[PDB]
């Protein structure tokens, strides 16, 4: 019952777990039974259903055995649907209808499952996400998804930190969470956030339609009263390994245009969705109008996000999943605050690609031969691939077919593979976040676009960060000064004029 995409989930784990070993890891998963329990309070409201929906979507992307536990006869209808959701993500997933074997349980609603395994009550009330290790928290009656969905991400994170407690440090599970996704402070009885289906996105652009965007699209599609025109922009297609992180991708979405998927995700909103199977540059070029009223960035590299700022939209919400945190940043250009280019201004020189690849090949001092084999695109000799294989700690045989091929070929296959030949000791360089990190970052992104287009008072700091591999922070807000180098385009009078020319002030 491990997923066909499990190696990608193992690539992710290997980046957060100490003393990772692929074989142990997969065995550790097979000994688990992760329980989702729920009662009539949860299945009867929109918040509880949302929380269940996302929780199953997260857990089915990692755990080979789930127990789906309706706690009364009312919850039996939702149960069948949850089993069907879990199987749509991993057709061979294991489904238990009993908790006798649970290693960890998540509970929505008001009823206690009465199990001997660690148990987390999750839930919500409007903007507030709730988790408790000792008592049910229940699910509210609003039509808001943000608190309910964020609670699932906190649910799944605490599941992961509990199963893998022995391979993490400073990683205690949470005892209580009462976090407002409206304010990102502890939820106050008076200090609640407005709840209204009266929200128009105007003309909004969502750039990047991958994992983080999937969390955002999950939320927007549960946002009642959403009106407006939304552009979704991505040129890529869903790959099998994306089902490790992309909460709206199941087996049936493999191979499909990410732009076509984002469209159908929103079919039940009142949004007029325009889907563009293009990169941002081609979108910008085909519009010929550089009026961007509102842009949500859900991309994977600095340069791509910096390019979005170059176009000078009125306002950007930027979303990221990095190694030690996920988060959201907010940028007007002409407001005194940091700009998206600020967020990635380089501070110094770094290692060149021929050098970083030389470390990943266990040949740190062959940087000159890696640069030459990359420029000359010549075949890797036999004595090179024996050196690399020995430096990599694997047998030479899996890497023998590469003898005579470009080094770019060797690195694009064995390295992008050797992780499995080394039982997880050789880590890949590219960060693969966990599904629950991507989903929460996307929920925050949907949160920001909706709040900003509903005109709420905007955030006091540029960015908000969460680290789901530790107990939730008590101060999620992160300030960020405008770059003071002079070298950031938000310092440039030509850029400032072109922004005012479009938006005034």
């Amino acid at each position: 019952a491990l997923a066909n995409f499990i190696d990608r989930a193992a690539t992710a784990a290997s980046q957060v777990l100490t003393d990772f070993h692929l074989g142990d890891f997969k065995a550790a998963l097979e000994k688990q039974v992760v329980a989702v329990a729920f009662d009539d309070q949860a299945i009867s409201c929109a918040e509880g259903q949302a929380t269940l929906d996302l929780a199953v979507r997260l857990l089915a992307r990692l755990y080979p055995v789930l127990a789906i536990l309706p706690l009364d006869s009312a919850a039996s209808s939702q149960a069948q649907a949850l089993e069907r959701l879990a199987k749509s993500i991993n057709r061979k997933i294991g489904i238990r209808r009993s908790g006798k074997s649970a290693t960890v349980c998540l509970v929505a609603g008001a009823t206690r499952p009465s199990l001997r395994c660690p148990t987390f009550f999750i839930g919500s009330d409007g903007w507030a996400a709730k988790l408790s290790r000792t008592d049910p928290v229940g699910s509210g009656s609003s039509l808001l998804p943000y608190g309910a969905g964020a609670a699932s991400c906190f649910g799944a994170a605490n599941v992961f930190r509990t199963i893998f407690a022995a391979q993490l440090t400073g990683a205690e599970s949470d005892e209580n969470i009462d976090l407002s996704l409206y304010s990102y402070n502890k939820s106050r009885a008076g200090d609640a956030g407005p709840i209204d289906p009266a929200v128009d996105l105007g003309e909004t652009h969502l750039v990047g339609l991958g994992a983080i965007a999937h969390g955002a699209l999950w939320a927007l599609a549960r946002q009642s009263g959403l009106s407006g025109r939304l552009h979704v922009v991505d040129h890529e297609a869903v790959e099998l390994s994306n089902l490790q992180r992309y909460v709206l991708a199941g087996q049936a979405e493999i191979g499909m245009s990410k732009a076509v998927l984002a469209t159908t995700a929103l079919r039940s909103t009142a949004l007029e969705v325009e889907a563009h199977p293009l990169k941002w540059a081609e979108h910008v070029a085909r519009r010929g109008d550089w009026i961007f009223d509102r842009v949500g960035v859900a991309l994977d590299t600095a340069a791509d996000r910096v390019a979005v700022q170059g176009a000078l939209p009125r306002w950007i919400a930027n979303a990221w999943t990095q190694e030690h945190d996920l988060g959201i940043s907010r940028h007007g250009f002409d407001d005194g605050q940091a700009c998206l280019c600020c967020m990635y201004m380089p501070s110094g020189k770094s290692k060149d690609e021929h050098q970083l690849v030389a470390e990943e090949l266990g040949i740190p001092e062959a940087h000159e031969q890696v640069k030459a084999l990359l420029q000359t695109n010549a075949g890797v000799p036999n004595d090179f691939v024996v050196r690399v294989a020995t430096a990599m700690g694997v047998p030479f045989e899996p890497l023998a077919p590469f003898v005579g091929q470009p080094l770019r070929s060797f690195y694009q296959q064995a390295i992008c593979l050797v992780f499995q030949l080394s039982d997880g000791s050789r880590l890949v360089r590219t960060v693969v976040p966990m599904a629950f990190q991507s989903a929460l970052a996307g929920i925050m992104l949907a949160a920001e676009l909706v709040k900003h287009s509903a005109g709420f008072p905007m955030s006091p700091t540029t960015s908000t960060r969460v680290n789901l591999l530790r107990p939730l922070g008590s101060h999620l807000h992160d300030p960020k000064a405008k770059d003071s180098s002079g070298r950031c385009i938000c310092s440039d009078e030509d850029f400032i004029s072109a922004y005012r020319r479009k938006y005034g002030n």
Binding site: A285, Y344, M345, K349, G486, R487
Partner: protein, 134 residues
């Protein structure tokens, strides 16, 4: 590369780079550097050693300012008559030039460390070609 910066920005920056070349055209001519054509986003130059007899076009280039100056300018060697890219049998490994920063071997020297310094502007590029090539 496609223009994605607001073109009112890059056009303004290119036009200023050109305005600033004009007072120096005579001086550049003396060193063999001749502005041939100018029209956003490209500026076409031809070069000739002033001391080489007979007088010989040693190089022609196209300089591209697409997405200037978030992105630094591309410098392509072309044939002075057809404007077509040429092979070495007839890129400048230098910061301020987009072919250099986009070379993975120089991923450690990012352009935003240099932006605004004087590298990557037109005079900087013209002066490097004049000094080395001759």
């Amino acid at each position: 590369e496609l223009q994605t910066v607001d073109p009112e920005v890059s056009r303004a920056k290119f036009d200023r780079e050109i305005s600033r070349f004009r007072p120096y055209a005579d001086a550049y001519r003396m060193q063999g550097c001749f502005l041939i054509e100018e029209s956003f986003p490209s500026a076409f130059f031809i070069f000739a050693s002033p001391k080489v007899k007979p007088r010989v076009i040693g190089a022609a280039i196209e300089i591209d300012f697409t997405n200037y100056d978030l992105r630094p300018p591309s410098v392509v060697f072309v044939d002075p008559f057809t404007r077509q890219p040429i092979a070495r049998k007839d890129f400048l490994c230098m910061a301020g030039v987009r072919e250099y920063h986009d070379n993975p071997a120089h991923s450690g020297d990012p352009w935003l460390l240099h932006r605004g310094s004087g590298e990557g502007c037109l005079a900087f590029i013209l002066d490097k070609i004049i000094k080395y090539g001759t």
